[PDB]
Design a protein around this ligand. Structure first.
Ligand code: GA5
Ligand code: CL
Ligand code: CL
Ligand code: NA
Lengths: 99, 99
């Protein structure tokens, strides 16, 4: 689809058996999800932005369904104020910015 | 143009006669630039990012070119880690997300 930017570009995702709303975010390198359980190994990471840094858990090789499109990649889990789909998964669904 | 997301979507902007680099960021409602001089009065705004909230200076009706496209609108100035072009200006340049 073509999503305009008049409002926040929010979509439904499926991750870990759960449905969530998330922001399609070209400014985010990585995908960052609010606290939830995911299977497998993880390692700690710090990520930063406006307001400073937060600590997250990095899970690799996680499958997500984004607006009906399946992708796999790393997911960061921690105290983000909104679920963010970053470039590492936007590429896999073929998302582009067009103007 | 059609911009893929394998790398950060960095473009050149021109503001105040000066060229700067900025990130096209669909996850930002507003445009936020690092400390610089802009004309006119400003008003206060608080914005929340991944690590918390920061105070910025809001300047309205500022002339700005984004990847060659002319825009006139609101620019927030403050301690952002990167210059960010948010949805207020992405809509003026006709940008959409496509997949
Ligand atoms: C390593 O992977 C990363 C690293 C950093 C980030 S980031 O979240 O810090 N960020 C990087 C940028 C700053 C280079 C992505 C960015 O899209 C972020 C992504 C983001 C968006 C929202 C909050 C946190 C992070 N948005 C904002 O920081 C942002 C900017 C301006 C404003 C907001 C957010 C504010 N958004 C807001 O409060 O959103 C709600 C109400 C939905 C929570 C509105 C006011 C202002 O217009 C994400 C993944
Ligand atoms: Cl990845
Ligand atoms: Cl591609
Ligand atoms: Na894993």
């Amino acid at each position: 689809p073509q999503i305009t930017l008049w409002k926040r570009p929010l979509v439904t995702i499926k991750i870990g058996g759960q449905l969530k709303e998330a922001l399609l975010d070209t400014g985010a390198d990585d995908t960052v999800i609010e606290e939830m359980s995911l299977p497998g190994r993880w390692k700690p990471k710090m990520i930063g932005g406006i307001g400073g840094f937060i600590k997250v858990r990095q899970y690799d090789q996680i499958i997500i369904e984004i607006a009906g499109h399946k992708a796999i990649g790393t997911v960061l889990v921690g105290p983000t104020p909104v679920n963010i789909i970053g470039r590492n998964l936007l590429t896999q669904i073929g998302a582009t910015l067009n103007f």
